[PDB]
């Protein structure tokens, strides 16, 4: 439906930048102020390129849950003058399944990609490249390398960021409002 596609487009236009680390280009979601998120396996350092502009990393936090298990989300505070539109009111407050989701990616390899991935289902556990990870969402689409950081949305909800796949299915780390309280 147009609302979902329009919402995804709005999120990408106003709340995403192309972040480049030592590992390559990632889709980076801006949440509020100078705070953004990126998959932890991107290996954020003291500096990060934001749309080909070297930006100092004022602070970084690789999120882990109460069990000390990886969540694959790294929150980053960026030394920039622009301020992200506050989208925290689009973040779910608890873990849930969703329908008619869209995965949106923007990098030099995947410019302006929009994928209707369909039903999204939450699982408490995923062995991501050998790293136990929690609070995962799964969708039945053959996602591929270079899509990490891609934003998963439904109409009015920014629910996760893409982190991996198995060839036939894709997996996203879940975004929760409590992460940015």
């Amino acid at each position: 439906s147009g609302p979902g596609f329009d919402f995804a487009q709005a999120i990408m236009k106003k709340n995403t930048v192309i972040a480049r680390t030592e590992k390559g280009e990632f889709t980076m979601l801006g949440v509020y102020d100078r705070v953004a998120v990126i998959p932890t396996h991107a290996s954020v350092g003291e500096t990060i390129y934001i749309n080909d502009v070297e930006t100092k990393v004022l602070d970084a936090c690789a999120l882990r849950d109460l069990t000390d298990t990886n969540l694959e989300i790294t929150i980053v505070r960026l030394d920039r003058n622009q301020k992200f539109r506050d989208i925290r009111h689009f973040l779910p407050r608890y873990e849930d399944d969703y329908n008619d989701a869209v995965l949106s990616v923007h990098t030099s390899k995947f410019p302006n990609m929009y994928i209707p991935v369909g039903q999204v289902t939450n699982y408490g556990f995923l062995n991501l490249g050998g790293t136990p990870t929690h609070r995962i969402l799964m969708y039945n689409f053959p996602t591929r390398a270079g899509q990490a950081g891609g934003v998963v949305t439904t109409t009015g909800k920014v629910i996760g960021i893409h982190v991996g796949g198995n060839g036939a299915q894709g997996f996203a780390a879940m975004l929760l409002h409590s992460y940015f309280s």
């Binding site: 590992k23 390559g24 280009e25 990632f26 998959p39 396996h41 991107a42 990098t107 390899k109 995923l126 062995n127 991501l128 490249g129 996602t143 591929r144 390398a145 270079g146 899509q147 990490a148 950081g149 893409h162 982190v163 991996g164 796949g165 198995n166 299915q169 894709g170 997996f171």
Partner: peptide, 6 residues
């Protein structure tokens, strides 16, 4: 699953 960055 495998991390699918660049």
């Amino acid at each position: 699953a495998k991390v699918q960055g660049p």
